Design an enzyme around this catalytic site. Structure first.
Site, PDB file in Angstrom:
ATOM      1  N   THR A   1       0.715  -1.310   0.000  1.00  0.00           N
ATOM      2  CA  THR A   1       0.000   0.000   0.000  1.00  0.00           C
ATOM      3  C   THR A   1       0.728   1.334   0.000  1.00  0.00           C
ATOM      4  O   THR A   1       1.908   1.444   0.303  1.00  0.00           O
ATOM      5  CB  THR A   1      -0.966  -0.019   1.188  1.00  0.00           C
ATOM      6  OG1 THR A   1      -1.704  -1.221   1.077  1.00  0.00           O
ATOM      7  CG2 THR A   1      -1.994   1.110   1.172  1.00  0.00           C
TER       8      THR A   1
HETATM    9  C1  LIG Z   1       0.248  -2.642   0.505  1.00  0.00           C
HETATM   10  C2  LIG Z   1      -0.098  -3.580  -0.699  1.00  0.00           C
HETATM   11  C3  LIG Z   1       1.426  -3.270   1.245  1.00  0.00           C
HETATM   12  O1  LIG Z   1       0.948  -4.513   1.755  1.00  0.00           O
HETATM   13  C4  LIG Z   1      -1.040  -2.428   1.491  1.00  0.00           C
HETATM   14  O2  LIG Z   1      -0.620  -2.304   2.856  1.00  0.00           O
HETATM   15  C5  LIG Z   1      -2.172  -3.472   1.446  1.00  0.00           C
HETATM   16  C6  LIG Z   1      -3.417  -2.826   2.070  1.00  0.00           C
HETATM   17  C7  LIG Z   1      -4.651  -3.314   1.572  1.00  0.00           C
HETATM   18  C8  LIG Z   1      -5.812  -2.846   2.202  1.00  0.00           C
HETATM   19  C9  LIG Z   1      -7.088  -3.248   1.806  1.00  0.00           C
HETATM   20  C10 LIG Z   1      -7.219  -4.143   0.754  1.00  0.00           C
HETATM   21  C11 LIG Z   1      -6.074  -4.614   0.109  1.00  0.00           C
HETATM   22  C12 LIG Z   1      -4.801  -4.209   0.509  1.00  0.00           C
HETATM   23  N1  LIG Z   1      -1.845  -4.642   2.269  1.00  0.00           N
HETATM   24  C13 LIG Z   1      -1.902  -5.898   1.804  1.00  0.00           C
HETATM   25  O3  LIG Z   1      -2.191  -6.206   0.648  1.00  0.00           O
HETATM   26  C14 LIG Z   1      -1.584  -6.973   2.843  1.00  0.00           C
HETATM   27  C15 LIG Z   1      -0.127  -6.917   3.242  1.00  0.00           C
HETATM   28  C16 LIG Z   1      -0.101  -7.465   4.527  1.00  0.00           C
HETATM   29  C17 LIG Z   1      -0.026  -8.846   4.706  1.00  0.00           C
HETATM   30  C18 LIG Z   1      -0.008  -9.387   5.990  1.00  0.00           C
HETATM   31  C19 LIG Z   1      -0.064  -8.551   7.104  1.00  0.00           C
HETATM   32  O4  LIG Z   1      -0.051  -9.088   8.359  1.00  0.00           O
HETATM   33  C20 LIG Z   1       1.004  -8.594   9.200  1.00  0.00           C
HETATM   34  C21 LIG Z   1      -0.149  -7.170   6.923  1.00  0.00           C
HETATM   35  C22 LIG Z   1      -0.165  -6.630   5.642  1.00  0.00           C
HETATM   36  N2  LIG Z   1      -1.886  -8.285   2.251  1.00  0.00           N
HETATM   37  C23 LIG Z   1      -2.828  -9.107   2.753  1.00  0.00           C
HETATM   38  O5  LIG Z   1      -3.527  -8.863   3.739  1.00  0.00           O
HETATM   39  C24 LIG Z   1      -2.997 -10.414   1.972  1.00  0.00           C
HETATM   40  C25 LIG Z   1      -4.035 -10.228   0.860  1.00  0.00           C
HETATM   41  N3  LIG Z   1      -3.431 -11.492   2.871  1.00  0.00           N
HETATM   42  C26 LIG Z   1      -2.548 -12.231   3.562  1.00  0.00           C
HETATM   43  O6  LIG Z   1      -1.326 -12.075   3.513  1.00  0.00           O
HETATM   44  C27 LIG Z   1      -3.178 -13.333   4.433  1.00  0.00           C
HETATM   45  N4  LIG Z   1      -2.569 -13.293   5.762  1.00  0.00           N
HETATM   46  C28 LIG Z   1      -2.931 -12.029   6.453  1.00  0.00           C
HETATM   47  C29 LIG Z   1      -2.518 -11.997   7.892  1.00  0.00           C
HETATM   48  O7  LIG Z   1      -3.038 -13.201   8.512  1.00  0.00           O
HETATM   49  C30 LIG Z   1      -2.571 -14.418   7.894  1.00  0.00           C
HETATM   50  C31 LIG Z   1      -3.062 -14.486   6.498  1.00  0.00           C
END
Ligand SMILES: *[C@@](C)(CO)[C@](*)(O)[C@H](Cc1ccccc1)NC(=O)[C@H](Cc1ccc(OC)cc1)NC(=O)[C@H](C)NC(=O)CN1CCOCC1
Ligand SMILES: [Mg+2]
Ligand SMILES: [Mg+2]
Lengths: 195, 231, 235, 240, 244, 233, 212, 222
Positions: G1
């Protein structure tokens, strides 16, 4: 959070608190007011863990304001400080303790005396002529030991405070974006806008 | 008299008056009929309205794909008991991958109703239920009474003037029991049965309620224009 | 004394039957359902002229597509409305959609019999729940403290209910316009009300698919009252 | 826990415990609320069978719920403290979560809800208290006056009275209060409030309390002499 | 079930009165009279012991007057056992406040909380109320010397002079007659004893049938002293005012 | 959180044209110590199901008690307990599968791998696996532990897909199972020579064979083997 | 993000990217990171996708309940504080959120509140949140004035996301623009970085580091 | 220490057309380097024209599908047999998944069906409940292999109109069910070649207004 100072002089208590809010490699805000008015003649500055600080400050504020309405009376700075200390003293043995350090500056209207209390997150209370939390103390205390006198005016206290901020701005590693200064005296609480 | 203040009290002749008063609520309720063959089980219910501006109180409730009931008395109590049956049918499916036997369904309702008749503070359920279903031992029809007494039958009826339909089914027993592999004829027999309990009113399109379950038929309810066939 | 959840010899719950008497003492509320919308109207009935009548809130929004009118011990309705609103919003959160008017009514009616020795007594208030959904269209429900609800084309509850209901029986047909329904509620309210009907002691509202649930202004209702008086004099 | 359903319906559809709580209110000392063009005034009777009282420390009849809202009552005094405390706590809780003080309507709605909850909860009796809640919403200059009662119903009033002989003072206010032109000033509003209490009270000495609330948390209680001047002025105009 | 035997202690009469509270007050009206008088330089607490026996140990006895903290005392009228339950609660409540704020509890705050406990027993729980009326005598730096009274209803009020228990009607008339605002403690002592002496159901008021206490600023400079009178001290003060 | 103490090794099984075969050795290992030799790890439920269990034996004995109790509970108020409303293999499995997954979800698993073999009331072969994790799967051949690595390859040469099941007789199927048990004795360090075998047929019913032994073993070639490389003597 | 929102003469601009990542795996390029809570209320999402997605739509349910109960649209301050008090209850449990509650009300005017998962709640004129926040700040700060036109402010918000999308590996996909006025929020389209970059490069003459 | 999670391998794929939607998945089930089953289906018809698959840890996958199937059942009981829309199903699943936010279902979930305008719809979830509607999504072990191929062939990414100097993009258009199944079959055969946990068989569930149809195809068994 980071820098909070306090100086008790003849007729007032002066609290200086840094304006910076940093998170990671970004200064998100440079105009943050790290203080809450607990009562008309009592001010509390705070520093520590993100979220915990404001949550704790406002929780105390609500309780003191509740007391004021219930009794139609203002609690003494000493009474407020003891209440705050006990809340932190409970907190330290909780499942998740408040990681908040506070300074409580107040003017006791019954005694006609300014009072400054320093309380850390463990619930360690001390009344002081001058106080600081965190790394700030490592510079300011020795400076105030030298220049502070007990009979100083509010104007002398502000100049003494300028000397502390200058020293911190010279030797501190982080940019804390200056300070918001507030004075607590017989007439209540007011903010110095040009510092 | 002095022994009807609560359900926890027996009368000097050994009667539970609160349970009997709950039984009385069923008699005030609108008539409903239940009957079965060896292949299908049918519920027929006369619905009741508040006035000509109101809807007709729904009498039949689905419990699972293979089970459901009709009600007579307090409708909220039927909702509580039907919901309990829905959960018990569901527990049997999720845990044991097994369709709940209609007999066990009766045993569970009996035991739930009983607890309300032996403790202080509570009250008996104020509703009678006719449970139909098709399980591993074929078609079934049960009659639930809030005293706790559950009874398996070929046919029956509960509610106001239920004695007319109950007499008819007692005569027709040998005929309708052998209506196998013919849904429409088994319903016709049930519609004719409930007609023996009618007074001044006749079966209309938004008055009649029919349900059926069987060998190759999930528990389905017919209302409105879908029951016009049987009038 | 006697148990709260006791049956009478006729097979009725004493407390539920007694709560129905409390509702008969309440102020009149009328609802009419059309294909263009559902109209809800109530008698405010201020106990004194010094009481500011606009603070009398007997018509209430549950969601954008569901409204509600009340009659009886109106204080008892607060927790019923609170539950209804939570039920409506909660369903939208879980399912990303509007909740069916019937499902809402059923949820409110589940509270009704949760009393005994749960709350200490039944509710002493009846509700008229009016709304719209995509499946069954415009609907009007009458929710009682017995836990029972009937769908109605038109319904009156309160002190002038049996007289108003007999009037609604004659006047209602399946082709009523919204404007016709508005006037009909005003007409029947004016008949059963003690004091003379005006914009300050009676309130109108409606729910339409397009604009949702709306409580009418005193200025808007006043014109409908004037339009009603002129039409009755015109023949 | 004690579970008994004390508030229950009777054959005629009345909840007698709620209605008997209203009798307790009818026994209580008279309280009156009158709102002007730019203020609300809360007047309260204090019975004079109690001499040797210490008025410094004796609980005042009008209570501050927040700096901008006040609450007076009629009925059981002990019961009123429980409502006032809850109201005061909710006032601070609202400031904490909404970052804005309560509206007078909201605070009233809360207090009324508490009163209602005690009419269909097991093991409790209703509050033998009716309240008058008055004040000004944050950043608003429109006066607010609300009334609650044991049943839980609440409503707004241009002027209202509760307690003993309240039907007499309500009769007075009904003909003396003009909706088209409310008391234009503080003096006019206080006078009408004092006049209305003088229909019922006895002597205008240490029997009448008056509290004036103005916009932006401007609440002050009148002293004996200040009130006595209104009493003296009204009686001289009366002899005519 | 058990509904049959429930007295329903927390309900209203048709007239809007709390049966049990009214009957508790009727109970208290037979208890020994207790009087509190507030002067400008102190407070007097006087109380009459309930018909004494000659073999009662008088010096090591406590029935009417109890100490709540160093600044606050109470005179009791009603069931002693009930009063002690409430007194220990009040004592704990004072210590909680001191622990929290490092300041002695203001008198009214202590009175309100004790009165709130009584109120609770009249509204919920289905228990009988406490058959006790208190006279609170205390000092704090906000209002100075204060007299309060609470009763089974949980309602409390402030007073210049007040009586609870038996013959309050007669006692209050006498106090209302001779009380004036510029009064001193020693005058108030005399008024308290004179009032009991006239309202008493006994033949003559003696030292062995009395409990007495003062709260003065008669210590050394700006501090308050509680004096619970010994038997011999009551005997002397009774002679000094010419009652015996 | 557990660690298994007394353990049972491979349970192997397969479908054939009319039913299912399942087998498991009679050993209760205590680490490397081959502690107990009279342990029955195949447990029949009614006359139409056999549950084979590997892993922790204390947990196996707990599961035995649950199944035993399930039979009792099913018989309550059930006139058709020995007929239409008898316990099916699919009911017994789903119950265990539910328990296994609930226990793993409470972080306190039954440390087992379980194979439920049986024949349904309509004649269909039932064979399904479940383990400590609550993981379930079905296949023409199923095996646990070392069986999964050594038995399955051999049993899949007989029944490689669904269409191979009607073409497989009980003689051919049992021969493959008995062969697999021998291979496991050669190669699994926590296996024993003694084992039990159960056949659930839709016609002949449940046949439970106890005290079987691995036989026709090849050891003679061992005499020719000398040293580990260069040694000639 | 990378998400931003800034206050200016003509109201509030809100701009976000649309990339989701799972480590170095690009999970999505078309994610909505702005949630329309109500016609006058927006919420931005950064951190754990679900944590933001789940709790901000829940926030919308709480704001709806407020206006039903209070017959008045919720303040931006009160809305942000519901969310901040919620995440504070979960402090330490491992929620990951960097959100910005943007909106206009009569009493407040245009307002932006930063709210994160360790409980921080800050009112402010300019915030950038996300892994590419620093890249957005660089462009935004160096070109920001209060007196920007609605046209210029929209572009600066769009250009700042593009800057971050380019440099930050975990930002990209497309830019979603929003403008919040006294009348409510207005959507100003989805802008794919695939085309937007070259269009901006050519027209603006910037991005000289890149092989043209 | 006991590890409550496992990896059962396999991969799944959902594509949406104009008036249809497919949800495909291989039938192989594995642990470590062993094959548990060559035919263990993980794409399920859940009723109301919703197909679902939860790929990853099979125990969690089955648990979730089981709960959602049950959720559909109770939706009918509580709301007068109303059809559960795909968007409503998606939101409901988010709450199922997030309900275990701090002890997650280790699965990439995909559902497919038709929206309320009759158009094809695919929704995809992360393990903790974040969801998004898409034209295209691959999930599971070989998601990283298949997904870039789908971007190129379904959404025509990086494809420009010949001779337009890379200025005009290849225009988006809906694919026929015949064309989609070709892409699914090629995606899985390619995945089977290069990923060890993918193979044995391919089962596709196609969803049109007429109902749910199935198609099965053999995959390499090595
Ligand atoms: C940018 C892309 C950097 O990551 C943004 O922060 C983005 C924000 C966002 C908000 C709303 C909808 C889409 C995207 N964040 C992500 O895409 C995020 C990155 C992230 C992963 C894990 C985290 O935990 C510490 C924190 C941030 N990605 C995700 O959430 C992905 C889609 N899902 C996973 O990785 C599944 N994980 C999440 C945590 O729990 C275990 C499973
Ligand atoms: Mg990038
Ligand atoms: Mg291989």
């Amino acid at each position: 959070m980071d820098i909070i100072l306090g100086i008790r002089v003849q007729d007032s208590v002066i609290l200086a608190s840094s304006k910076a809010v940093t998170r990671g490699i970004s200064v998100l805000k440079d105009s943050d007011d790290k203080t809450r008015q607990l009562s008309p003649h009592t001010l509390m500055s705070f520093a520590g863990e993100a979220g915990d600080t404001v949550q704790f400050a406002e929780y105390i504020q609500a309780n003191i304001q509740l007391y004021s309405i219930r009794e139609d009376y203002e609690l003494s700075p000493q009474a407020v400080s003891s209440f705050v200390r006990q809340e932190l003293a409970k907190s330290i043995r909780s499942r998740r303790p408040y990681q908040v350090n506070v300074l409580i500056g107040g003017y006791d209207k019954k005694k006609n005396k300014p009072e400054l209390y320093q309380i850390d997150y463990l619930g360690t209370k001390v009344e002081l002529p001058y106080g600081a939390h965190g790394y700030s103390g490592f510079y300011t205390f020795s400076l105030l030991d030298h220049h502070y006198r007990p009979d100083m005016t509010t104007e002398e206290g502000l100049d003494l405070l300028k000397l502390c901020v200058q020293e911190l701005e010279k030797r501190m590693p982080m940019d804390f974006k200056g300070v918001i200064v507030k004075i607590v005296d017989k007439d209540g609480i007011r903010q110095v806008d040009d510092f | 008299n002095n022994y009807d203040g609560d359900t926890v009290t027996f009368s000097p002749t050994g009667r539970l008056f609160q349970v009997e008063y709950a039984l009385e609520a069923i008699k005030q309720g609108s008539v409903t009929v239940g009957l079965r063959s060896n292949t299908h089980a049918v519920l027929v219910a006369l619905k009741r309205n508040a006035d000509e501006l109101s809807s007709y109180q729904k009498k039949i409730i689905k419990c699972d794909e293979h089970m459901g009931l009709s009600l007579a008395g307090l409708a909220p109590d039927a909702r509580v008991l039907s919901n309990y049956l829905r959960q018990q049918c569901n527990y049997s499916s999720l845990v044991f991958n097994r369709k709940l036997a209609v007999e066990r369904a009766g045993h569970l309702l009996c035991d739930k109703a009983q607890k309300n008749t032996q403790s202080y503070g509570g009250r008996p359920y104020g509703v009678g239920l006719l449970i139909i279903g098709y399980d591993k031992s074929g078609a079934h029809l049960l009659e639930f009474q809030p005293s706790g007494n559950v009874t398996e039958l070929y046919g029956t009826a509960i509610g106001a003037r239920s004695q007319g339909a109950k007499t008819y089914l007692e005569r027709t027993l040998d005929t309708f029991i052998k209506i196998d592999g013919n849904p429409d004829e088994l319903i016709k027999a049930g519609v004719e049965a409930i007609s023996q309990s009618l007074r001044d009113e006749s079966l209309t399109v938004d008055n009649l309620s029919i349900a059926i379950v069987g060998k190759d038929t999930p528990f389905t309810i017919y209302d409105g224009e879908a029951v016009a066939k049987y009038i | 004394d006697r148990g709260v959840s006791t049956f009478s010899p006729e097979g009725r719950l004493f407390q539920v039957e007694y709560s129905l008497e409390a509702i008969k003492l309440g102020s009149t509320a009328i609802g009419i359902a059309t294909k263009e919308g559902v109209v809800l109207g109530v008698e405010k009935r201020a106990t004194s002229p010094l009481l500011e009548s606009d603070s009398i809130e007997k018509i209430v929004e549950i969601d954008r597509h569901i409204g509600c009118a009340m009659s009886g011990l109106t204080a008892d309705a607060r927790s019923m409305i609170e539950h209804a609103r939570t039920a409506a919003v909660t369903h939208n959160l879980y399912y990303d959609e509007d909740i069916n008017v019937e499902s809402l009514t059923q949820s409110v009616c589940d509270l009704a019999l949760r009393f005994g020795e749960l709350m200490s007594r039944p509710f002493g208030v009846a509700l008229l729940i009016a709304g719209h959904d995509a499946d069954d269209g415009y609907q009007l429900f009458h929710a009682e403290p017995s836990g029972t609800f009937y769908r109605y084309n038109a319904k009156a509850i309160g002190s002038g209910s049996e007289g108003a209901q007999a009037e609604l029986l004659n006047e209602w047909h399946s082709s009523l316009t919204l404007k016709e329904a508005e006037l009909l509620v005003l007409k029947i309210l004016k008949q059963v009300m003690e004091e003379k009907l005006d914009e300050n002691n009676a309130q109108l509202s409606c729910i339409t698919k397009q604009d949702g649930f709306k409580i009418y202004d005193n200025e808007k209702t006043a014109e409908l009252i004037k339009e009603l008086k002129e039409k009755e004099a015109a023949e | 826990g004690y579970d008994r359903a004390l508030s229950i319906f009777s054959p005629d559809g009345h909840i007698f415990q709620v209605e008997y709580a209203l009798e307790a209110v009818k026994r209580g000392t008279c309280a009156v609320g009158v709102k002007g063009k730019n203020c609300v005034v809360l007047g309260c009777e204090r019975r004079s069978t109690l001499k040797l009282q210490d008025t410094r420390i004796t609980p005042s009849k009008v209570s501050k719920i927040d700096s901008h809202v006040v609450l007076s009552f009629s009925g059981l005094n002990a019961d009123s403290r429980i409502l006032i405390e809850k109201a005061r706590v909710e006032a601070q809780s609202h400031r904490l979560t909404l970052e804005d003080p309560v509206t007078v309507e909201y605070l009233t709605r809360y207090v009324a809800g508490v009163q209602q909850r005690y009419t269909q909860s097991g093991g409790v009796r209703p509050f033998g208290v009716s309240t008058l809640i008055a004040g000004f919403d944050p950043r608003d200059d429109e006066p607010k006056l609300y009334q609650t009662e044991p049943s839980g119903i609440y409503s707004s009033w241009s002027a209202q009275t509760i307690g003993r002989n309240s039907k007499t003072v309500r009769e007075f206010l009904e003909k003396n209060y003009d909706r088209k032109e409310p008391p234009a000033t503080v003096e006019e509003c206080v006078k009408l409030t004092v006049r209305s209490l003088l229909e019922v009270v006895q002597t205008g000495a240490k029997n009448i309390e008056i509290t004036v609330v103005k916009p932006d948390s401007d609440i002050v209680a009148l002293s004996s002499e200040e009130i006595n001047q209104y009493v003296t002025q009204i009686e001289q105009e009366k002899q005519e | 079930g058990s509904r049959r035997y429930d007295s329903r202690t927390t309900i209203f009469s048709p007239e809007g009165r709390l049966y049990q509270v009214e009957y508790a007050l009727e109970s208290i009206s037979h208890a020994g009279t207790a009087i509190g008088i507030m002067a400008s330089d102190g407070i007097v607490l006087a109380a009459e012991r309930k018909v004494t026996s000659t073999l009662l140990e008088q010096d090591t006895s406590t029935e009417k007057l109890y100490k709540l903290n160093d600044k606050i005392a109470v005179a009791v009228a009603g069931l002693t056992a009930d009063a002690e339950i409430l007194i220990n609660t009040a004592r704990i409540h004072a210590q909680n406040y001191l622990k929290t704020y490092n300041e002695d509890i203001p008198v009214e705050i202590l009175v309100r909380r004790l009165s709130d406990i009584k109120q609770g027993y009249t509204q919920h729980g289905g228990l009988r109320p406490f058959g006790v009326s208190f006279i609170y005598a205390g000092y704090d730096d906000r209002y100075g010397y204060q007299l309060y009274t609470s009763n089974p209803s949980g309602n409390y009020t402030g007073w210049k002079a007040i009586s609870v228990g038996a013959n309050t009607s007669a006692a209050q008339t006498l106090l209302q007659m001779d009380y004036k605002d510029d009064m001193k403690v020693d005058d108030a002592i005399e008024l308290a004893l004179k009032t009991l002496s006239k309202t008493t159901d006994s033949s003559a008021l003696t030292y062995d049938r009395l409990e007495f206490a003062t709260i003065r600023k008669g210590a050394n400079d700006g501090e308050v002293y509680q004096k619970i009178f010994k038997p011999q001290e009551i005997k002397d003060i009774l002679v000094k005012t010419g009652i015996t | 959180t557990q660690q298994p103490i007394v353990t049972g090794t491979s349970v192997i099984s397969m479908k054939y044209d009319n039913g299912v075969i399942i087998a498991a050795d009679n050993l209760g290992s205590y680490g490397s110590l081959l502690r107990f030799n009279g342990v029955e790890r195949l447990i029949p439920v009614g006359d139409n199901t056999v549950v084979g269990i590997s892993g922790d034996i204390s947990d196996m004995q707990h599961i035995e008690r649950l199944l035993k109790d399930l039979v009792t509970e099913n018989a309550y108020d059930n006139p058709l307990a020995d007929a239409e409303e008898a316990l099916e293999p699919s009911y017994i499995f789903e119950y265990l599968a539910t328990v296994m997954y609930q226990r793993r979800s409470k972080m306190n698993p039954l440390w087992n791998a379980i194979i439920v073999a049986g024949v349904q009331s309509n004649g269909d072969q039932f064979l399904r696996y479940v383990n400590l994790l609550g993981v379930t799967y079905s296949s023409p051949t199923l095996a646990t532990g070392f069986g999964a690595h050594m038995a399955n390859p051999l049993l899949r040469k007989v029944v490689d897909r669904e269409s191979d099941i009607p073409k497989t007789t009980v003689q051919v199927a049992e021969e493959a199972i008995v062969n697999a048990m021998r291979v496991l004795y050669y190669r699994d360090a926590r296996s024993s020579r003694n084992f039990s075998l159960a056949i659930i047929d839709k016609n002949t019913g449940l046949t439970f064979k106890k005290n079987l032994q691995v036989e026709n073993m090849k050891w003679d070639f061992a005499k020719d083997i000398k040293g580990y490389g260069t040694q000639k003597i | 993000t990378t998400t931003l929102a800034f206050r200016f003469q003509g109201g509030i601009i809100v701009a976000v990217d649309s990339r989701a990542t799972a480590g170095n795996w690009v999970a999505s390029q078309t994610v909505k990171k702005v949630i329309e809570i109500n016609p006058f209320l927006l919420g931005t999402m950064a951190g754990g996708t679900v944590d933001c997605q789940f709790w901000e739509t829940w926030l919308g349910s709480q704001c709806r309940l407020h206006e039903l109960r209070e017959k008045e649209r919720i303040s931006v301050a009160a809305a942000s504080k519901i969310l901040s008090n919620l995440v504070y209850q979960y402090k330490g449990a491992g929620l990951s959120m960097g959100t910005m509650i943007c909106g206009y009300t009569r009493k407040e005017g245009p307002t932006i509140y930063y709210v994160d998962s360790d409980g921080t709640r800050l009112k402010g004129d300019i915030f950038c949140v996300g892994s590419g926040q620093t890249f957005a700040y660089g462009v935004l700060d160096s070109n920001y004035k209060w007196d920007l036109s609605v046209e210029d402010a929209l572009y600066l918000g769009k250009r700042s996301i593009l800057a971050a999308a380019h440099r930050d590996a975990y930002s990209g996909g497309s830019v979603n623009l929003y403008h919040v006025t006294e009348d409510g929020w207005i959507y100003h389209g989805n802008h794919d970085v695939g085309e937007l970059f070259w269009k901006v490069k050519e027209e603006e003459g910037s991005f000289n580091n890149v092989i043209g | 220490q006991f590890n409550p999670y496992g990896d059962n391998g396999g991969t799944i794929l959902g594509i949406a057309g104009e008036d249809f939607a497919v949800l495909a998945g291989d039938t192989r089930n594995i642990t470590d380097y062993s094959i548990n089953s060559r035919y263990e289906p993980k794409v399920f018809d859940c009723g109301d024209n919703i197909v679902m698959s939860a790929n990853g840890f099979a125990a969690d996958g089955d648990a979730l599908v089981k709960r959602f199937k049950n959720s559909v059942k109770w939706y009918h009981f509580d709301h007068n047999d109303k059809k559960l829309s795909i968007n409503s199903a998606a939101r409901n699943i988010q709450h199922l998944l997030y309900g275990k936010r701090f002890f997650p279902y280790y699965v990439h979930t995909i559902i497919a069906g038709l929206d309320e305008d009759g158009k094809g719809a695919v929704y995809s979830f992360d393990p903790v409940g974040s969801y998004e509607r898409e034209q295209c999504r691959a999930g599971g072990a070989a998601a990283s292999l298949i997904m870039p191929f789908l971007d190129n062939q379904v959404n025509f990414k990086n494809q420009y109109e010949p001779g337009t100097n890379g200025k005009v993009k290849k225009p988006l258009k809906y694919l026929s069910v015949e064309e989609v199944i070709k892409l699914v079959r090629d995606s899985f055969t390619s995945a089977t070649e290069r990923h060890i946990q993918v193979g044995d068989g391919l089962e596709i569930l196609i969803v049109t207004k007429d109902g749910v149809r199935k198609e099965f195809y053999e995959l390499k068994r090595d």
